[PDB]
Structure 1
């Protein structure tokens, strides 16, 4: 009947773009259910949050069947 009541905007998005250099446990993408899949050396935590495990450069490559988006980190 009356309607205000929004929420407080959880600050999602994609950090660490296509040519960065990452540390051991950085946050790559704050996902909301797998826009991006776990590529070569990344983690996929509890609420589908991609994080690194090794060092290098982010790739953002599209692979395979289903055309899914794979975030791999390359030792380069």
Structure 2
């Protein structure tokens, strides 16, 4: 219950944090965003939350998605909503340990 957006766009998120909960795929995992068993979306890197539309391409193996995707109007393609976390720090830095 209480499915919704736990973190809104622009917020400084720390790793592991949960961004949104959903019974069905209202949003899809984006960049540096993980997917949970229950389909909740959590931050894989500390950063800033960003929502953006993007084209949807499914795994070749799944029959339902390849069939639906294939049977689309040549002109255009369907889209989806994605959630991304923008990493805000470098992985690490080099420091002087000792002079020998």
TM-score with structure 2 setting the length: 0.63
Deviation at 1:66, TM superposition (A): 2.1
CA offset at residue 75 of structure 1? 2.0
Given the alignment, which residue of 55, 66, 74 partners 2:78? 66
Alignment size in residue pairs: 67
- Normalized per residue, the structure richer in strand is 2
8 Å CA contact 1:43–1:53 kept in 2: the answer is: yes
More helix by share: 2
Residue 4 of structure 1 corresponds to none
Uncovered stretches (5+) of structure 2, i.e. residues with no partner: 56-76, 89-100
2:12 maps to which residue? Answer: 21
| Structure-1 separation of matches of 2:87 and 2:45 | 8
Residue segments in structure 1 that go unaligned for 5+ positions in a row:
1-9
CA-to-partner distance for each residue in 1:18-73, whole Å, 9 max, x for gaps? 11001110010011121000101011100111011101100000012421001011
Query: Which runs of at least 4 in structure 1 moved beyond 3 Å after TM superposition?
Result: none
**CA-atom RMSD in angstroms:** 1.1
The structure whose Rg is larger is 2
